[PDB]
Design a protein around this ligand. Structure first.
Ligand SMILES: CCCCC/C=C\C\C=C/C=C/C=C/[C@@H]1O[C@H]1CCCC(=O)O
Ligand SMILES: CCCCC/C=C\C\C=C/C=C/C=C/[C@@H]1O[C@H]1CCCC(=O)O
Ligand SMILES: CCCCC/C=C\C\C=C/C=C/C=C/[C@@H]1O[C@H]1CCCC(=O)O
Ligand SMILES: [Zn+2]
Ligand SMILES: [Zn+2]
Ligand SMILES: [Zn+2]
Lengths: 608, 608, 607
C-alpha cells in the first residue's frame, strides 16, 4: 500500500534484507572503500526470480550466490536516486525462502555518503580521516542495499584500516586484530544485533582517542578535542536516564559520542551506539546540550520506531523534538521547556516564510515523488511535528498523560517501520475514551495542508518576555535612544536568552546600520564564540548591510560546515551586494574540500 | 440560477475571466510547469473586494495586481475539487470594472491533469514527453482559474521547452524562438482568439513531427507514427466540409490532429485547433474514423456551444454523437448511420446494466454534488443523449428537418454556455408549429429518470441482420453444431459487422469454453489488431473462462491506456479467478507509470 | 375548486391519511434524511399512478409492499417545485389504501428550513434548526400532497445529536438513545388529530423548558426561557377564554417555542407547539395579542382549515376576530375596539401600498401562478376581520355573532372548506335574518379589490388621546415645539404610544426639527418594545434623520421578523443617505438569513 518513492530497490513486499555482513578495506591512497556486502535476503512471494538493489556511484565487480557468480545489470542512473542493480537469481525463490547474496564492490571517491579528509584538514595534521553520513538515502553510495527505511536488518562488519588509525561504526565493538594480509593494517570488528534501517549504518576512521564520561558512554574525537568534549557533554548519562524513564529501556547497549571534524553537515546524527555531533557544540559551557538530548531521544523515536518512508519523516523528528524538550525540561525546568518550545515555533515561522505558505515542503506529511530528500529537508517536520504533539498534549490532559501515550507508542511499534496512519490509529486507540476530543482536531490541515498550523499551542512566557522587550527596544529605537543602550542590558540574560533576543531581532531585519554598529559597541557580540549566537549575530549584521561583518561571516561559513550555519550565511552573503562576488568566489575556492552534500546544496543556493 | 458543484471559484455571476496570458516553462527534470498566469477578470457586481479561484496541488508564489503583491489565502483541500484560493483585491471593484491578476504558480509532479513520460515510455526512446488532459475539472491542476465551463476566455501563451522538443497547444501557433534566458531551450507562442472554457486548454511537449493531410490539417506524432497516422485519418478534411455544412462555419482556423502515446485515457479529446487522439485508432484501414468525426463535431457542439455545468454534459456529447453519425452517414450511407445508431443503443444497454437501471448516473441530466466527474463518466450522456435526438428527429419530420434545428441551435448559442432548459426552450421555439407533437414527449423520464429511455427509436436493420443471425447461431449452438461453423461465415462482413457480432455475443457471455476455442479455430480473431474487435474478443474469452486469453488481455490492458479498454479488461481479469491475482499484481507494478486518472479509476475498480 | 399552488394529485383522486416520518438531522451537511411513509387512499377506480409535491428533494427510492416501484421527478415549476409521479404496482379501486415509503433527503437550501451555526444562537455552543411550512414549504421537507385540502395524522422518529432536543407539532412520545449511533438520540412524536401538512413542524436545538400552565411549557434556549415564561404568563387564561368561545381544545398540549431572532413571523400556530418571535419579549407582556392569535388558530385554521390558499382569509380573518375577543375579555371591550380600529389603519396602509385595484387586495384571491409568500399581506387578516366585525354589528352584536362562530367551528371541525361553505353556513345559521344578509355587498366584500365598501363602527375612547397628540405634532410649527414635554405621555399605555406613532407615521414625513424634538422629550430611542421601536425608526428614516440610519439597520438585521425587516430595508433604500449601505448590508447578510426572508428582501431591494 505504501511505496517508497525514494528507493529503486525491490520493496519490502517482494523481499526483505534480514542481515548485512560487510567486509571492507578503507584505502586512503585512493579514497575508496572496497569489499564485499553479503545480504541475507528473504523472499516474500512465490516465484521470485530477480530482485533490485539501490546503488549510487558504485563499481560492481561481481555477485556471488552459493559459490557461483550470477548475472546482474546496472540500470541507467536516475539522478540523486543512483542506479538500480537487478540481480538474476540462480533459482526462483518461494515465500519465506532465504538466500545470501555476496556483492563485491568499491565506492567512488565522490560518494555522496562519505567525506575524505586530508591530514591538513584534521586537528592533528598527521593522519587522514573518513566519516559517513547515510541519512536519508546515501547508504546506497556506500554499498548495494534496499535503501529504504521500511526494511530493518542486523549487521556485522569487518573493516581493514591503516594500523595507526581507529575505525568505529554504529554497532558494538567486537575486537581488533592486525590484518593478516598486510602488517601495516588492522581489522576492527563490529556487531549490531538490533534490526536497523540501513540509513543508520555509519563508519568513521581516523586518529581517534576516547574519554569515558558514563557507565555506557565514551566520547571519541581527535586528541585535541577529546577532553573539551567530555566536559561539554558531561550531562549525557543523566539525559539517558531521563530518556529511559520516558521511552522505556535503552536497547542499544552502548551510547558513545563522536565529535567529528568541523565539516560535519548536521548538528548530530543518531547512529545507533555512536551518535555523531558537530564540534560547533563546544560552546565551553554545555549550553548546546539540547542537541545531545535530541540524538539520545532517537534511540527510541527514529531508531526503534522508524518512519516507513521519508514522506513520514515528521514521525522521526517531531517525536524526537518532543522527547528532547521533555529531557531538558526535566533537567532545567518546565518554564525552560516552554521557552525552547516557543523558540521552536519561531523557527517554524522562519521556515514557512522561506518556502512560502503554500509550498508542498511545509506540509507535515510530504510527497517526495521526484524530490531529492536533501533539497526538501527543513525545520518543518521537526517543529510542525513538535507543534502538533505539544498541541495534542495540551488538548488531551497535559504532559503526564501524553507521555503515557508516547511510552506506549514506542512499545507498540518498537523494531518496526510505520506510517502517519499507524501513529494516528494508535493515538485513537490509546485515547479511546477521548475520541470526541480527538475528533475536534483539524487532521487534514495539520497533516496535509501547507503553511503554519491551524492552531498555535499555549506557551509560558516567563523566560521569553525579557527577550521580546530588549528586541522591541532596539527595533523601535531612534538615534536619540542609541546612547541609552549599555552592556548592563544583558545583565540577567542567559546565553539561551541572548540567542532568542537575536532570533527575534533577526526576524525584523534589516535594522538601521547605525543600530548594528551600536549593538556591537555596547554588547561586543563579535567576541562571542557560541555558534548559535554568532550565527544569528552575523546574519543580523550582513542583512543590515554592515561591511565589517563580511570577513567574519565568510570565516564562519567556511571554517565549519554545519549546513544550519553554512547555507544561510552563504545565502545572506550572496544577497548582500558588497559581498556577492566574494561569496561566489569563496564557494568555488572551497567546494572541492567541502562535504559533498553541503557543496551540492550551497551550489544550488548560489545558483552556480 | 444554476450552480456548478464541481468548482470552488467565484461563479460567473460574481466575476468573469475574459483572457489568460500564460507564460511558463516545462521542466522535465522536476516534472513541473512553472510560470505566470495573468487573468483578465471583470467584476459582475458592485463592491467586489475578493474573489476565489480553483487550484489543485499548485504552489502559489505570489499574486500581483498593478505591479504590487496582494494578499491571498489557500483554503483547505476538498479532495477531488482541489484547494480554493481567495485573493484580496487592493481596491473594491464596481460592475464591469476589469483588473489583470498575475499569479506566479508551480504545478506538482502529481498533477492530475498531466502525464510525464520518460524516454523509454515514448516511441523514439530518446526524449521525454508531456501531455495534458483538463476535461472535466483538471485545468485547476495546471494553473489557477475559474475551473467551470460557464466562463469563456481567450488566451495567449508563451511556453519554454528544451530546444530538442516541440510544444503544441489548443490554439494557433504563433512562432518559435530560442529562449533568450537559456540557450538549451526554445520558446513557442500560441494565440486562441475564440473564447473557450478552460477545460479546453491543452499542452503537449515532445519530439513531434508532422504531415499535412488537408488545407487546414497537420497530423502530429512522434516520427514512428506520423505517416501511418496521415493515412489512417485521410478523411479528415472531407469530414470537416460535411460538418461545416451541418453546423455552420468552422471558426477555429486550424484543425490539427495529434496522435498521443498509448497511455492517452480517451479515444479523442476535441481541444480547439488540435484534437488529441489515441493511437489505438490506427487499425490500418480507416475503420475507426468515427472518432475523428466525433472530435470534429465538438468544434460546434461543445467547444462553440458549451454545457454551463457538467450536470448538463449530455448537451455536449449527445449532440456531438448525433453530428458524428450524420457525418459518417453522409460518407457511407444512411443505412450505416442507422447501423451505428443501433450499436450505440446496445452500448447504452450495457451502461445501464453496469450501473443498474435505477442508478442516478443513468439519468440524462445528472446531479454531481459531491461526485467526482471522472467517476460518474460513462456512455450514458452520449447514447441516451443521442437516442433523445434521434427519437426527436423521427418525431419531428426526419433528418433534414432536424438538422435545420441543429444548425439554428448552434448559431443561437455560439460562444455561450447553456443548460438543458436553454436547449429545450429553443427546441419549442424553433418548432412553434409542432408544440402538440413535442408535448407528447415524456420529458420527465427522458431528462430526469434513470434507466433505459421510455421509448426506443426506429432503426433500419439492413446491416445489423447478418450480425444478429451469426451471434444467435453461436449462442444457441450445441457441441454437435460447432463443426458447421467456418471461416466463410465472415466473408460478407465488414470490420464494423465483425465488431457488432462480438458485441451482441458479449452481451450473452459467458459462452461454453468449447464454443470459444472453436471460434478462434475458425475465425482466428487472435490475429485481428483492430482495437475495438480485439477488445470485445478478449473480454468474451476472459468472461468465458479461457485461460489462454489471460496474457493477451493483460497485454492489451497495459500496453495501451484507453480507459474504454483498460478498465473493462482489468475488471474482467479481476473477476476471473484464474487471473485475479495477476490482474492486481500487474496494476500495482504499472500504476506508477500510468496516467493519473486511469490509475485512480483502475485502482478503484480493483478495490486496492 | 382546484389548488393552484399544488402539483400533486388532488383530494378527489387520492387522499393521504397518515404520515410516518423517520429521519435524521445532519448539521454537518445541513440535510434531513430518512423515509416518509404515506398511507394513501384512492378516491377512484383504476387508479394506477399518483403525483406528489416536492421541492429540492433528493429521492433515493420508493417502496410499496417491500418492493421498489417506478417513479419520475418532473420538470421544476419555479416556487411550486417538482412533481413526483409514482407508478403503482397494481391498480387501486375506490377506497383501497396503500402505504408508500419514500427515501428522501432535503437540500441545504430548503425553503422550509433555516440552519443556524452555533454563533447564530444565544448559547453559542450548539447549532439550531427550525422549519416553517406555511404555506407550501412542507414539500421542501418531504414528499406529500402539499395542499390544505388533505388532512392526515402523523407519527415521527427524529434522530439528532444527543446533546440537542427535538420538538414537533405533536405530542411528545418518548426519547431513547439511537441504537445505531451512540452520539445521537431519537425523539418520538404522535399527532392524532388530522392536520393539513403545512402544520408539520420541527425544531432541533439546545432547548430548555419552563412550565407556565397545566398544559403549557415554554421552550427556548436557556438564555431566554425564564424571560419568556414571564412574558407569556397569560397563556392559560387565554386558552380558557378561547375554549369558552370556540369549544373544546382538542390538541392535548399547548406548548410555546421562542425561536431565534431570524424567525420570519410573529408566530406560527403549529399544533401542540406554537412558534413565536423573540421580538415579543417586551418585558411587560404588552405584545401578548400574538399569543391570543396563535391560540385561536387551534380552532380557526388548524381545526377548520382553508381548502386552498385562495381562501386564506377564512383562517386569518376569523383568527383575528377571535384574537380580539380574547383580549377584549381580558382587558375590556373598549380595548377590543381600540385594536379593531388600529387593524383598520393597517388595512388602509396595505391597500394604499398595493393600490386600490391590486388583485392582492381582494379578500378571496386567485393564486394562479402567484407565489403565496409574495402575495402574503395584512389584507386577509384585516379585511377579513373587518367583514366579520361589520357582520357582528349588522346581525345583533358580539354575543349573537360569537354564537355563529362557535357553531361554525363545530360544523366544520377537522374539515377543509371554502368561502362558499362559510357563506352558506352563515345564511343557514341566520335563517331569520336573511333580509339583513341580503343587504351585504358580497361581491364587493369577497371578490373586489381595494378598501371595503363600508366601515364598521368603532369606539374611540382609547384612540382619541392618540389622535390628539399626533395632530398636535402634525400641525405644530416652530413656536409650538418647546411646548412638547415628557408629561405628554404620562397617561398613555404602550399600546397608545404605538398607536400615536402609527398615526404620525401615516402623515410622514414630518419636519426634521420635529423628529429631533420628539426624541428629546419622549426618548423613544430607549424603548425596546419592538412594535414601538419599529414605527419610531420608520418615522425617523422617512423624515430623513441620518442619526436613525445605524439604528434602523441594526433592527433590520439583528432580528428577522418580516413585519419589521422588510419595511425597514425598504425605508432605508428609499432614503438616499442610507441606500447604498442598506443594499450592502443585505448582500452581506443574505447568505445567513432565512431563505424566504432573504428572497423577499432581495425582491424588495430589486437586487
Ligand atoms: C518532510 C521531508 C522529509 C525529508 C527527509 C529528508 C532528509 C533527512 C536527511 C538528513 C537528516 C539528518 C538529521 C539529524 C538530526 O535530526 C537532526 C538535527 C540536526 C539539525 C542541526 O542542528 O543542524
Ligand atoms: C453526465 C455528466 C457526467 C460527468 C462527466 C463529465 C466530464 C467527463 C470527463 C472527460 C471526458 C472526455 C471526453 C472525450 C471525447 O468525447 C469522448 C470520446 C472518447 C471515448 C473513447 O472512445 O474512449
Ligand atoms: C389571501 C391569500 C394570500 C396567500 C397567503 C397565504 C399564506 C402565506 C404564507 C405564510 C403565512 C404565515 C402566518 C402566521 C401567523 O398568522 C400570522 C401572524 C404573524 C404576523 C406578524 O405579526 O409578524
Ligand atoms: Zn533528529
Ligand atoms: Zn465527445
Ligand atoms: Zn394567523
Amino acid at each position: 500500500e505504501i511505496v517508497d518513492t525514494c528507493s529503486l530497490a525491490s520493496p519490502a513486499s517482494v523481499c526483505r534484507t534480514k542481515h548485512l555482513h560487510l567486509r571492507c578495506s578503507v584505502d586512503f591512497t585512493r579514497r575508496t572503500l572496497t569489499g564485499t556486502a553479503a545480504l541475507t535476503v528473504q523472499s516474500q512471494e512465490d516465484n521470485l526470480r530477480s530482485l533490485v538493489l539501490d546503488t549510487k556511484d558504485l563499481t560492481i565487480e561481481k555477485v556471488v550466490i552459493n559459490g557461483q557468480e550470477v548475472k546482474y545489470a546496472l540500470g541507467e542512473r536516475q539522478s540523486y536516486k543512483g542506479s538500480p542493480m537487478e540481480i538474476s537469481l540462480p533459482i526462483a525463490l518461494s515465500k519465506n525462502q532465504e538466500i545470501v547474496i555476496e556483492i563485491s564492490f568499491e565506492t567512488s571517491p565522490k560518494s555522496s555518503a562519505l567525506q575524505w579528509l586530508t591530514p591538513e584538514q584534521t586537528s592533528g595534521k598527521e593522519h587522514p580521516y573518513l566519516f559517513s553520513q547515510c541519512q536519508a538515502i546515501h547508504c546506497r553510495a556506500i554499498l548495494p542495499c534496499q535503501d529504504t527505511p521500511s526494511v530493518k536488518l542486523t549487521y556485522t562488519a569487518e573493516v581493514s584500516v591503516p594500523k595507526e588509525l581507529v575505525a568505529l561504526m554504529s554497532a558494538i565493538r567486537d575486537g581488533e586484530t592486525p590484518d593478516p594480509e598486510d602488517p601495516s593494517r588492522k581489522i576492527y570488528k563490529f556487531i549490531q544485533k538490533v534490526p536497523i534501517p540501513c540509513y543508520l549504518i555509519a563508519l568513521v576512521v581516523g586518529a581517534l582517542e576516547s574519554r569515558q564520561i558514563g557507565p555506557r558512554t565514551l566520547v571519541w574525537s581527535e586528541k585535541e578535542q577529546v577532553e573539551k568534549s567530555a566536559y561539554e557533554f558531561s550531562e549525557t548519562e543523566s539525559m539517558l536516564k531521563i530518556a529511559e524513564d520516558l521511552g522505556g529501556p535503552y536497547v542499544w547497549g552502548q551510547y558513545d559520542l563522536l565529535v567529528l571534524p568541523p565539516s560535519f553537515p548536521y548538528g548530530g546524527m543518531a547512529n545507533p551506539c555512536l551518535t555523531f555531533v558537530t564540534p560547533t557544540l563546544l560552546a565551553g559551557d554545555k549550553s548546546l546540550s539540547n542537541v545531545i538530548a535530541h540524538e539520545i531521544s532517537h534511540s527510541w523515536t527514529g531508531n526503534l520506531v522508524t518512519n516507513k518512508t521519508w514522506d513520514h519523516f515528521w514521525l522521526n523528528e517531531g517525536h524526537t523534538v518532543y522527547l528532547e524538550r521533555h529531557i531538558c525540561g526535566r533537567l532545567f525546568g518546565e518554564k525552560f521547556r516552554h521557552f525552547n518550545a516557543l523558540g521552536g515555533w519561531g523557527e517554524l515561522q522562519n521556515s514557512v516564510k522561506t518556502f512560502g505558505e503554500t509550498h508542498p515542503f511545509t506540509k507535515l506529511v510530504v510527497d517526495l515523488t521526484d524530490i531529492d530528500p536533501d533539497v526538501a529537508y527543513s525545520s518543518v517536520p521537526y517543529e510542525k511535528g513538535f507543534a502538533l504533539l505539544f498541541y495534542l498534549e495540551q488538548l488531551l490532559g497535559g504532559p503526564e498523560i501524553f507521555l503515557g501515550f508516547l511510552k506506549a507508542y514506542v512499545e507498540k511499534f518498537s523494531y518496526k517501520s510505520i506510517t502517519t496512519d499507524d501513529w494516528k490509529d494508535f493515538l485513537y486507540s490509546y485515547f479511546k475514551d477521548k475520541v470526541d476530543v480527538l475528533n475536534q482536531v483539524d487532521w487534514n490541515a495539520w497533516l496535509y495542508s501547507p503553511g503554519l498550523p491551524p492552531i498555535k499551542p499555549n506557551y509560558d512566557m516567563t523566560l521569553t518576555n525579557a527577550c521580546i522587550a530588549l528586541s522591541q527596544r532596539w527595533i523601535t529605537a531612534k538615534e536619540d535612544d542609541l546612547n541609552s543602550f549599555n552592556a548592563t542590558d544583558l545583565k540577567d540574560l542567559s546565553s539561551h536568552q541572548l540567542n532568542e533576543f537575536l532570533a527575534q531581532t533577526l526576524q525584523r531585519a534589516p535594522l538601521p546600520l547605525g543600530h548594528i554598529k551600536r549593538m556591537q559597541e555596547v554588547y561586543n557580540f563579535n567576541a562571542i564564540n557560541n555558534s548559535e549566537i554568532r550565527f544569528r549575530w552575523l546574519r543580523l549584521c550582513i542583512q543590515s548591510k554592515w561591511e565589517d561583518a563580511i570577513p567574519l561571516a565568510l570565516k564562519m561559513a567556511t571554517e565549519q560546515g554545519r549546513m544550519k550555519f553554512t547555507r544561510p550565511l552563504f545565502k545572506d552573503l550572496a544577497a548582500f551586494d558588497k559581498s556577492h562576488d566574494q561569496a561566489v568566489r569563496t564557494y568555488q575556492e572551497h567546494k572541492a574540500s567541502m562535504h559533498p552534500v553541503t557543496a551540492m546544496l550551497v551550489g544550488k543556493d548560489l545558483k552556480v
